Write a protein that binds this ligand. Structure first.
Ligand SMILES: *[C@@H]1O[C@H](CO)[C@@H](O[C@@H]2O[C@H](CO)[C@@H](O)[C@H](O)[C@H]2NC(C)=O)[C@H](O)[C@H]1NC(C)=O
Ligand SMILES: *[C@@H]1O[C@H](CO)[C@@H](O[C@@H]2O[C@H](CO)[C@@H](O)[C@H](O)[C@H]2NC(C)=O)[C@H](O)[C@H]1NC(C)=O
Ligand SMILES: *[C@@H]1O[C@H](CO)[C@@H](O[C@@H]2O[C@H](CO)[C@@H](O)[C@H](O)[C@H]2NC(C)=O)[C@H](O)[C@H]1NC(C)=O
Ligand SMILES: *[C@@H]1O[C@H](CO)[C@@H](O[C@@H]2O[C@H](CO)[C@@H](O)[C@H](O)[C@H]2NC(C)=O)[C@H](O)[C@H]1NC(C)=O
Ligand SMILES: *[C@@H]1O[C@H](CO)[C@@H](O[C@@H]2O[C@H](CO)[C@@H](O)[C@H](O)[C@H]2NC(C)=O)[C@H](O)[C@H]1NC(C)=O
Ligand SMILES: *[C@@H]1O[C@H](CO)[C@@H](O[C@@H]2O[C@H](CO)[C@@H](O)[C@H](O)[C@H]2NC(C)=O)[C@H](O)[C@H]1NC(C)=O
Ligand SMILES: *[C@@H]1O[C@H](CO)[C@@H](O[C@@H]2O[C@H](CO)[C@@H](O)[C@H](O)[C@H]2NC(C)=O)[C@H](O)[C@H]1NC(C)=O
Ligand SMILES: *[C@@H]1O[C@H](CO)[C@@H](O[C@@H]2O[C@H](CO)[C@@H](O)[C@H](O)[C@H]2NC(C)=O)[C@H](O)[C@H]1NC(C)=O
Ligand SMILES: *[C@@H]1O[C@H](CO)[C@@H](O[C@@H]2O[C@H](CO)[C@@H](O)[C@H](O)[C@H]2NC(C)=O)[C@H](O)[C@H]1NC(C)=O
Ligand SMILES: *[C@@H]1O[C@H](CO)[C@@H](O)[C@H](O)[C@H]1NC(C)=O
Ligand SMILES: *[C@@H]1O[C@H](CO)[C@@H](O)[C@H](O)[C@H]1NC(C)=O
Ligand SMILES: *[C@@H]1O[C@H](CO)[C@@H](O)[C@H](O)[C@H]1NC(C)=O
Ligand SMILES: *[C@@H]1O[C@H](CO)[C@@H](O)[C@H](O)[C@H]1NC(C)=O
Ligand SMILES: *[C@@H]1O[C@H](CO)[C@@H](O)[C@H](O)[C@H]1NC(C)=O
Ligand SMILES: *[C@@H]1O[C@H](CO)[C@@H](O)[C@H](O)[C@H]1NC(C)=O
Ligand SMILES: [Cl-]
Ligand SMILES: [Cl-]
Ligand SMILES: [Cl-]
Ligand SMILES: [Cl-]
Ligand SMILES: [Cl-]
Ligand SMILES: [Cl-]
Ligand SMILES: [Cl-]
Ligand SMILES: [Cl-]
Ligand SMILES: [Cl-]
Lengths: 11, 171, 322, 322, 171, 322, 171, 11, 11
């Protein structure tokens, strides 16, 4: 799983 | 918290910083604004992602588990099966709740530590070219334009470049 | 000119507990505890369950007349009994090792109901039309669909001896019954021998049954009793029945296939056109979360059951929009 | 002018263990492990226990003459056996499903001992005065208070058939016995029939007993045997006894009430005028602590048993009075 | 400890501070004395109270549990019942002892952190109007009466008010 | 002039996992998980195991002719069966409470095989030479070494009654058998009585056996059956056999000693001249580590079995030689 | 890490410091070299030894445990014995793996804290007689021979002795 | 439960 | 057990 909190994150 | 930054010497959070967990606010002649620190935020995200995933992974898939039946002359076996089911249930409820509490504590501490470490990194970069005005802020003894600000944010601040002017204003 | 260091705040109202402090509002969090189900009985990995309708396991296996007859061959992923199963054993008596039989059926994935001993052909010189009111159907007195009440014919009950060789290539569940009249008068009128006996043997099974006559309290208006027995006949093996009275003979038997992940559940819910990976007696769970507080009884790939009302992990920060 | 920051120290000598270091002296701490009991048997939530004195469960239920007769009706919170229970089964033989019976009694909260089959009235044309030296009382040969040794009268043992209908509105524990003489001579002298039998039926119970005659090693100076049986007669149901020999008939039976939290313990301690919420075989625990290392056997609301010698949580600081 | 204050740069505790876990000692012309910091002490008490109570709460009430009996032909069932009782006992003894050790470690660390944070709070309040003389003490570059001391203790120290005099003494 | 503060780095490539991060290279670490065994069967604390060779427990206890006879007295630390045990029960039939018997043997540390009923001396007026092809040895038809097939002699089978008094000062395992012919003709030809019976009693054991004649599917070319029974005769107690047919009598019995830490394992490995404190079916473990992932079945003092592939604790620092 | 020293403001480790976990590197006229701090290293060794030993001790000796057998009419008891064995196995695998992860995290943090505390101890000893040049290093404002260096290492640095010369060089 | 260590505590 | 990583350790 991933925490997609910001769109620039690398996930 | 354990490291004294969050809800500590940095009283509150920033609703205006929308692109990261930790970051900066700046004010100069060109204007003011918020900019998250992506390196530390990404590190924290990596860590906490691995923590959550670890917690999920340690719990195996629960395969089929249904009740059994016993006749009126098998009360002992029925009660033993029940004692087994209830025991395992107690233990897993305990384990789950405790693990979540412990890890929550450690997570908040982890954040607190990240914010403190960022603050200290900036402080050590700036030295006596600026003064700590509390609440996690620094006031420069020199003019710091957007380029200067960015040099501070991406860890390349040139202390000697502003050392003279700072020394003069600091007097 | 100034630069400040700070941290994220947002509008979130998620709360988590810690050890030092309860009820902390945080910016980001994940719920680890599944608490939602769809309230339906579903297919499990594309295979429908075996629903017994008005019957329990006993009623279905013995062939109680009151339940709608199933198709000759069935395959399932789990077995469902209804809480109010009125139709089970209709003629009073003990079902020996019934619980063990249920446990056997818990790993069976398919059955084929076939005629092991044809009615008009297996028991010559005996009557096969015996019926009772304890097992009534549409008002009339009837009997188990899978068993046959053998009685005396033309004033005589000759010793019978019949056998079946298992060439199905699978285990064959064979069921039979032993009748116990309340008096010797009825024993004579039915089986014409007061010293009757029943013998059932295979390569690994070996049992002998003797009538035990005594007056008994009425159950379903019956003072007599009927004890039900069963055995699993291995592939290639032979079962032999031999009797001079009291035998409630097998007529239909079950060829059984084995599988994994099955089980027997008691449920109220209804079957729907839907599919799931996890089924509980209350409904199906569609979730990848590690825990669930819905039900201890699960079939398939399910989260671990816990008593907890809440298991929420913080991922974000202590939220201070102030 | 100076100001200093510091922390509390005191005289405390409490020590706790940590992971990095053992045996750390601290200013404040709490003990989580209860290790004290009062060494007495007490009331549990205001209800006294059932003490069997010189008897175990078998001796009490069969009615062994050596134990002081209890009041007709009793209610309790737990059952106590003494380690050295000398009076149990006094006439040698097997007690069938005895352990299961104990497990049943483990959830019983009350009994009423009543005469199910009156002595001079239930078995006409039979003698009821049979006694034995294996069950002696005050020197003289005697017998179980709850059972009745039926023998031949005037050279004959007519077939008896008696029944009881349960109108107590509760489960009724019925016990009986089957006697097995060492030779056929004694079998004839006692029951006048060599081919005797005993039959016991209810709506859900159905058993038949046959004498098995053979010479046996002496136990309590007896070569004969006596097998003891029991059943729980449901409210409204009827039990029927039928025999032409060897029946050790029921005379008194038990109307039983069900409860929760009870159990059977073996203890040495004595009953005192005291009350507790938690009882162990060694004594009662008065505590709200989460753990105890006193005993694995507990009745009531008790702390969880652990093997630990010490469970002490630090609350204060590392204590450095230096 | 983890934060270096308790048994660290602040060597020992104060038997003379009897009204709290953390606090102050002062010395001026009007005299000297101890005074605990009630805010931090109360915070710590709240935390540790919630920790202790959490530990107690996670352990459910142990309801009735007694032994069973088995005949001479039920050895397997007897040994299985025994294996169940012994297994559950092992697991709970393990869980209890481990939880107590872990939480003890974290509690001492927590205290250490509270003392360090208090020290840093004072330091940041005083700035260069005083000097760190080690052992957790500050020496003022100005006269600090009872009112001044109390302003330091309740977090309202007026730096500009003494800045001049301090600058002069610091020279 | 300068002074710097720093920390150890080295060349180590040990990696450990943490909660925030996986796969961290560290300077020092300890492995807590044992994963190595020597692939051999060894002595356990200086005592060799009991190896049954071609036999399982049944074959050894009954005295199957195909296995190499053991020394009269043996003492062991654990019992080893081979996976492919071809020689067990050689004459078809049920071994009553066999599993319970294995569980008894699991705490036995020594046996002495002694002649409880001498062949030419205990059963006069009966033949003792009965053999069968189901229990063949070296081609010829044979029989169990520990049992004796008693048959009719000179056209008669007189009622026998023999007994043994246990003066070994230890428990004595006594085994016997009950034969069940497929027809009454064979029953008469062997035991000359159609209404035969066998009786076995001790102070606490009491059982009666009746021949049950019926045609049965051939097993090992036998339509007859043979049921095997056993009992543990307490020190000082007496066992009594009494029969007029069908008794497969005891000839050798076992004096048994009890011990701790033993068990029964199925293994492929071979016995070697070696000693260990921990034995698994795959091999012996020589380790003081707290965990092992080798096998769930252990004998002696072993690490706790876990499914983990890796359990490595870091002791040193995060290793950064850069 | 949590305290920001290891892989933090002190970027890497020293392959050249072979006699301890934490320590020093110095450079003066007499020459240069590495020397571990034995007090802190010994403290850390004591701690981690006690941690490892604690983990081993909490796991009791696993005594004899073998399988049982059941006939074809004891399927329920067989499955219950199996459910017991599998349950206990799940719980112990879980406990072991989790305990090792938690303790590993805490161990790395512990080291990080030791290095930071050592650094701070030196800093507080030196005061303004030297300047922080980053990367955990100090540059003296005075000549510091082997004896001076050793006084720093064994915690007896004489600040007043070099205060004048330092003040002059700092100007 | 409460830790009544000081009388001014709030408990 | 002991971690014998350095020879000067005290173990
Ligand atoms: C980090 O910040 C430094 C300072 O702002 C950046 O240096 C500037 O980079 C731009 C390229 O877009 C140059 O044209 C500017 O002249 C640089 N400023 C200076 C001080 O010369 C640097 O590019 C930034 N990026 C990184 C990754 O360091
Ligand atoms: C604050 O958070 C709330 C959620 O509690 C957000 O509400 C959502 O708003 C989005 C679009 O703005 C909608 O699509 C959703 O239906 C709303 N509810 C949920 C549950 O997401 C709200 O937008 C947030 N506001 C700010 C300023 O962050
Ligand atoms: C848990 O914390 C929440 C805050 O998230 C508390 O709810 C707040 O309570 C205050 C005081 O009554 C109200 O002013 C807020 O409006 C509440 N917030 C919301 C969103 O409801 C709550 O009282 C706490 N619960 C407990 C039992 O501690
Ligand atoms: C130091 O602690 C001890 C306890 O170990 C205290 O001894 C108690 O003193 C009080 C009154 O002073 C008595 O009522 C108790 O009977 C004593 N024992 C206990 C177990 O409390 C002692 O008072 C403390 N002294 C100081 C100066 O703190
Ligand atoms: C545990 O720590 C205690 C200190 O509380 C040790 O006991 C002290 O031991 C020293 C050295 O012998 C004595 O001088 C003190 O008088 C002792 N204190 C008391 C109150 O007895 C004890 O030795 C330690 N135990 C272990 C095994 O570590
Ligand atoms: C905290 O300390 C400040 C400084 O001592 C206090 O301010 C004093 O308060 C009193 C009231 O009793 C005034 O009369 C004094 O004149 C104040 N001193 C100053 C600097 O003017 C303040 O009252 C204290 N209380 C709180 C909660 O802040
Ligand atoms: C680096 O560590 C390796 C181990 O991975 C060391 O290799 C050992 O070297 C010693 C003597 O130098 C030999 O006795 C061993 O056989 C080698 N292997 C093992 C497994 O110990 C190597 O020596 C180390 N080198 C340095 C410079 O530290
Ligand atoms: C675990 O970490 C190790 C480092 O110890 C990784 O192995 C290194 O991988 C890099 C990139 O491929 C190679 O350059 C190194 O040579 C590898 N080191 C060794 C000694 O093999 C490894 O890739 C990591 N594994 C995972 C799955 O994270
Ligand atoms: C710690 O360091 C101080 C300073 O180096 C040492 O003091 C020296 O000790 C030697 C003894 O070998 C004396 O002859 C030197 O003259 C001392 N130097 C000074 C400043 O006078 C001290 O010996 C060291 N040892 C300890 C444990 O403190
Ligand atoms: C389903 O059964 C439960 C009892 O288990 C009962 O409470 C409920 O009323 C039933 N609901 C429906 C819809 O039948
Ligand atoms: C189950 O829920 C997930 C989450 O929305 C969804 O992606 C998936 O389609 C659902 N599956 C079914 C079969 O409904
Ligand atoms: C109580 O019984 C125990 C044995 O369980 C015995 O050790 C003890 O001596 C007895 N004590 C008393 C007072 O009877
Ligand atoms: C149990 O102990 C507590 C603690 O002193 C006491 O308050 C209570 O009165 C005791 N109860 C009884 C019934 O003795
Ligand atoms: C030992 O037995 C195992 C089966 O358990 C089998 O896989 C293996 O081939 C055998 N090995 C040897 C050497 O006999
Ligand atoms: C077991 O291994 C240890 C570690 O080398 C060794 O000291 C010991 O001699 C070994 N024991 C045997 C009997 O091989
Ligand atoms: Cl910014
Ligand atoms: Cl029957
Ligand atoms: Cl469908
Ligand atoms: Cl009987
Ligand atoms: Cl009282
Ligand atoms: Cl003060
Ligand atoms: Cl038999
Ligand atoms: Cl050897
Ligand atoms: Cl050095």
């Amino acid at each position: 799983x991933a925490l997609e909190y910001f769109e620039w994150l690398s996930x | 918290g354990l490291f004294g930054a969050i809800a500590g010497f940095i009283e509150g959070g920033w609703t205006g910083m929308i692109d990261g967990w930790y970051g900066y606010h700046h004010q100069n002649e060109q204007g003011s604004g918020y900019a998250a620190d992506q390196k530390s935020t990404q590190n924290a995200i990596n860590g906490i992602t691995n923590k959550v995933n670890t917690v999920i992974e340690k719990m195996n898939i629960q395969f089929t588990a249904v009740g059994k039946e016993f006749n009126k002359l098998e009360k002992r076996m029925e009660n033993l099966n029940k004692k087994v089911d209830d025991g395992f249930l107690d233990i897993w409820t305990y384990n789950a709740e405790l693990l979540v509490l412990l890890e929550n504590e450690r997570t908040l501490d982890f954040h607190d530590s990240n914010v403190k470490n960022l603050y200290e990194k900036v402080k050590s970069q700036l030295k006596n070219n600026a003064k700590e005005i509390g609440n996690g802020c620094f006031e420069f003894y020199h003019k710091c334009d957007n380029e200067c600000m960015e040099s501070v944010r991406n860890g390349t601040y040139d202390y000697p470049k502003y050392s003279e002017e700072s020394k003069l204003n600091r007097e | 000119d100034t630069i400040c260091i700070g941290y994220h705040a947002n509008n979130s109202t998620d709360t988590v507990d810690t050890v030092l402090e309860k009820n902390v509002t945080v910016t980001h969090s994940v719920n680890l505890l599944e608490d939602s189900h769809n309230g339906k009985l579903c297919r499990l990995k594309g295979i429908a369950p075996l629903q017994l309708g008005k019957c329990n396991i006993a009623g279905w296996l013995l062939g109680n007349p009151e339940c709608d007859p199933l198709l000759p061959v069935r395959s399932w992923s789990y077995i469902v009994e209804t809480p109010n199963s009125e139709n089970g054993i209709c003629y009073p008596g003990d079902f020996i090792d019934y619980e063990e039989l249920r446990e056997q059926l818990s790993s069976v994935s398919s059955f084929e109901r076939f005629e092991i001993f044809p009615k008009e052909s297996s028991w010559p010189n005996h009557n096969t039309n015996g019926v009772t009111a304890a097992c009534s159907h549409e008002g009339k007195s009837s009997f188990y669909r899978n068993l046959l009440w053998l009685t005396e014919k033309e004033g005589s009950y000759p010793k019978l001896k019949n056998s079946y060789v298992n060439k199905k290539g699978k285990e064959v569940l064979v069921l039979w019954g032993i009748h116990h009249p309340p008096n010797s008068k009825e024993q004579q009128n039915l089986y014409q021998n007061e010293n009757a006996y029943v013998s059932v043997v295979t390569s690994n099974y070996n049992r002998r049954f003797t009538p035990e006559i005594a007056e008994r309290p009425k159950v379903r208006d019956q003072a007599g009793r009927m004890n039900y027995y069963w055995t699993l006949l291995k592939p290639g093996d032979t079962i032999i029945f031999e009797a001079n009275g009291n035998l409630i003979a097998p007529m239909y038997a079950f060829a059984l296939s084995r599988g994994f992940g099955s089980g027997i559940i008691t449920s109220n819910a209804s079957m729907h056109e839907c599919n799931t990976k996890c089924q509980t007696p209350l409904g199906a769970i569609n979730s990848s979360l590690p825990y669930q507080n819905i039900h201890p009884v699960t079939i398939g790939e399910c989260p671990k059951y816990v008593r907890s009302a809440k298991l929420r992990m913080v991922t974000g920060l202590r939220n201070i929009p102030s």
